[PDB]
Amino acid sequence: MKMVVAVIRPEKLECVKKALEERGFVGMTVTEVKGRGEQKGIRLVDLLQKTKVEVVVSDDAVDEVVEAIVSSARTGKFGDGRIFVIPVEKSVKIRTGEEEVAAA
Amino acid sequence: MKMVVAVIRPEKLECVKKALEERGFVGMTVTEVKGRGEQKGIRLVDLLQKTKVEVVVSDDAVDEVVEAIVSSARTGKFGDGRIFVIPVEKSVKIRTGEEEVAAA
Amino acid sequence: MKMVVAVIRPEKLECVKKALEERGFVGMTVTEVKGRGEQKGIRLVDLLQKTKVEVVVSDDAVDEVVEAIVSSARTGKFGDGRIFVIPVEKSVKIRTGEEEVAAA
């Protein structure tokens, strides 16, 4: 399992939700944050409001989650953000105590 | 070392704190977020307020942290949340600069 | 690539930003959280406001990021916080779709 963490423009959250829902990814966690990226060009940078979306998915769904977020979050301009993929070794359902365990 | 990340109902934070404290886990980080899970049944789902609790513990304490959060955060109803366990390779104490390093 | 996660005193955020900027680390994500550490001594502990800073850097930059945060965030007193280093397997630029992939 992997956690896919996207830091995106706040006005794009709804699009990203819809794009993920349509591929069958409804569980997520959303946090309000501030971020800045690294920019190229003559300088002459504040932390801006952004939205963090986290989904934990099977290994075989990562490409598809990342494609959905990229398609729906991108504008083509600096500040679109980044997606990070991080290993999750165990995912526990609190309601039942059942757990998923990462492949060896 | 592992980071144990629980996304739980906000009204359960105090119970989860107490349950962790009693097993000797006092250090944590708490973030206000919004989340939704995936539900089963006839549809005919907003992001709700939730609370994220993170603790970084030794490899040998993960089962015990996860048991404490499950016992104290569960209600038996949809929306209880999830716990994710993620590898931490290094944990640095800012006050002293000392670090813990994961097993090879 | 690694994600370096620092939970620091809020009044130290600007110092930590400057110290990271000067070493060439401008991209970051900042979240307002609450935390407490574990303390030594006669008891006789609330969650306090803290600031989470995340940067995702190349494997070869982790020591340098961690040194910069420790130098600029430390006061020598309990409550300075912790830095966690977590594996990132893929980092995707949303603007272009290009990705960085961790070493095998």
From Swiss-Prot, chains A, B, C:
GO MF annotation: an example: ATP binding
One GO term of the biological process aspect: regulation of nitrogen utilization
Family matches, as Gene3D superfamilies: 3.30.70.120
Residues at which ADP binds: T29, G37, E38, Q39, V56, G79, D80, G81, R82
Binding site for ATP: T29, G37, E38, Q39, V56, G79, D80, G81, R82
Keyword Nucleotide-binding among record annotations: yes
Localization in the cell: Cytoplasm
Pfam families, per the entry: P-II
InterPro entries: N-reg_PII, N-reg_PII-like_a/b, N-reg_PII/ATP_PRibTrfase_C, N-reg_PII_CS
Record key words, sorted: ATP-binding, Cytoplasm, Nucleotide-binding
The UniProt record lists the keyword Metal-binding: no
Record-stated family: Belongs to the P(II) protein family.
Role according to the record: Involved in the regulation of nitrogen metabolism. Regulates the activity of its targets by protein-protein interaction in response to the nitrogen status of the cell. Regulates the activity of the ammonia channel Amt1 via direct interaction.
Subunit structure and binding partners: Homotrimer. Interacts and forms a complex with Amt1.
Official protein name in the record: Nitrogen regulatory protein GlnK1
Name of the gene this protein is made from: glnK1
